[PDB]
């Protein structure tokens, strides 16, 4: 299964069925027929498949990457270190793209789960989405199709220069 | 097919006009080429500029769908005036009347 801390969900609160009439609803009868004719053979087949899988067990692992020095401590026109720095930067870039994807999935899940009170009950998810979108836009936007670590470093240097200059104007 | 059957340059002398009208299978006094303004028309005739919907729908054609006959000199915009495309057939009321009424 998945991890509930990365993908949060509130505990559900299901009301009890308290009917006010005498006509039997077909939903309960159809549900009982559903666990009779459908759920039992499906669960039996899954139990057999799980037994066959428990007969032969093997594992796989999540690949771990150690930290290589980045482009800020790389000599210019020294491809041996810049290649590793650029590979690390591209791996980080893909990881951040999936992080923003996770936050978008959280926001959509919150909206669908809350339904008609989504614009009040999903303030925290919207704030998290705004924060991660702002940081992604300040980190990776307007680079082009030929993006590299040097362009990102130049953009960050220009942003810090602008921030320092704007601080100096208002000091 | 022989080289003297293809269209040529614009005819000026009357004998070239007669030979062109003989080439296009039409009468000499019915053959009016396009004006020589240097737009590449050459000696191809200027037809009366009517759509294929205006032809007789009951006379048996060689091509019944196109309403056309084998060997007839076809229009310069025959691919424009087919029955699947723009029609020029007369309307019960006038064109300017239609435009004025719709715009108003």
């Amino acid at each position: 299964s998945w991890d509930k801390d990365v993908y949060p969900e509130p505990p559900r609160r299901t009301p009890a069925p308290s009917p006010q009439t005498s006509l039997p609803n077909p939903i309960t009868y159809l549900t009982k027929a559903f666990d009779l004719l459908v759920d039992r053979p499906v669960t039996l087949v899954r139990e057999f498949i799980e037994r066959q899988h428990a007969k032969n067990k093997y594992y796989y692992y999540h690949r771990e990457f150690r930290r290589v020095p980045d482009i800020t401590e790389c000599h210019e026109k020294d491809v041996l270190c810049m290649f590793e720095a650029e590979m690390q930067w591209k791996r980080d870039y893909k990881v951040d793209q999936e992080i923003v994807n996770i936050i978008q999935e959280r926001l959509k899940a919150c909206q669908q789960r809350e339904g008609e009170s989504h614009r009040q009950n999903c303030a925290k998810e919207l704030q998290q989405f705004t924060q991660v979108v702002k940081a992604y836009q300040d980190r990776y936007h307007d680079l082009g199709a030929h993006y590299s670590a040097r362009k990102c470093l130049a953009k960050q240097k220009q942003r810090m220069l602008a921030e320092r200059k704007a601080t100096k104007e208002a000091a | 097919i022989t080289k003297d059957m293809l269209p040529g340059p614009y005819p000026k002398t009357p004998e070239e006009r007669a030979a062109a009208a003989k080439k296009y299978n039409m009468r000499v006094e019915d053959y009016e080429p396009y004006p020589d303004d240097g737009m590449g028309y050459g000696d191809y005739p200027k037809l009366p500029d009517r759509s294929q919907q205006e032809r007789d729908p009951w006379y048996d054609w060689d091509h019944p769908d196109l309403r056309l006959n084998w060997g007839e000199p076809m229009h310069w915009d025959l691919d424009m005036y087919i029955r699947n495309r723009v029609d020029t057939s007369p309307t019960p009321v006038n064109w300017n009347l239609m435009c004025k009424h719709l715009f108003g």
Binding site: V100, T130, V133, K134, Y136, Q137, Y140, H141, D142 | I1, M5, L6, P7, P9, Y10, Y24, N25, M26, R27, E29, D30, D37, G38, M39, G40, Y41, G42, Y44, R50, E54, D62, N69, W70, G71, E72, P73, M74, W76, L78, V86, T88, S89, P90, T91, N94, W95, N96
Partner: protein, 128 residues
């Protein structure tokens, strides 16, 4: 009385309202006889080579080949550069190019000016 029907480019005059149909001169009769003779000659040739039981293939039409050669391969040798052709080529060739270049240059200059001043809304824009 009745409104007279006038022709247009997209609405031609009816055949029955054409005065030239009612002209019964002998020259018109000769012209229609010659036209019918030409049509009968072409129809006879077509249905003579079309009803042949031995032939299997395509009854080729010289008019179709003539039309294709006039439409495609005869445009250039009958073209002469004069004032009309040059003005039409310059008007319809580099006119829209200049127009769209100016439009897109103006819009992108305004957009870049708004973006670099922090005015345009670019809050959630992270896919470009």
């Amino acid at each position: 009385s009745f409104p007279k029907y006038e022709p247009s480019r997209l609405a031609s005059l009816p055949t029955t309202l054409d005065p030239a149909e009612y002209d019964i001169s002998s020259e018109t009769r000769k012209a229609q006889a010659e036209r019918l003779a030409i049509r009968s000659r072409l129809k006879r040739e077509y249905q003579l080579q079309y009803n042949d039981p031995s032939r299997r293939g395509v009854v080729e039409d010289p008019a179709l080949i003539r039309w294709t050669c006039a439409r495609s391969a005869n445009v250039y040798p009958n073209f002469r550069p004069n004032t009309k052709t040059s003005l039409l080529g310059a008007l319809f060739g580099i006119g829209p190019l200049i127009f769209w270049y100016y439009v897109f240059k103006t819009d992108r200059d305004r957009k870049e000016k708004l973006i670099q001043e922090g005015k345009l809304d670019r809050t959630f824009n992270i896919s470009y």
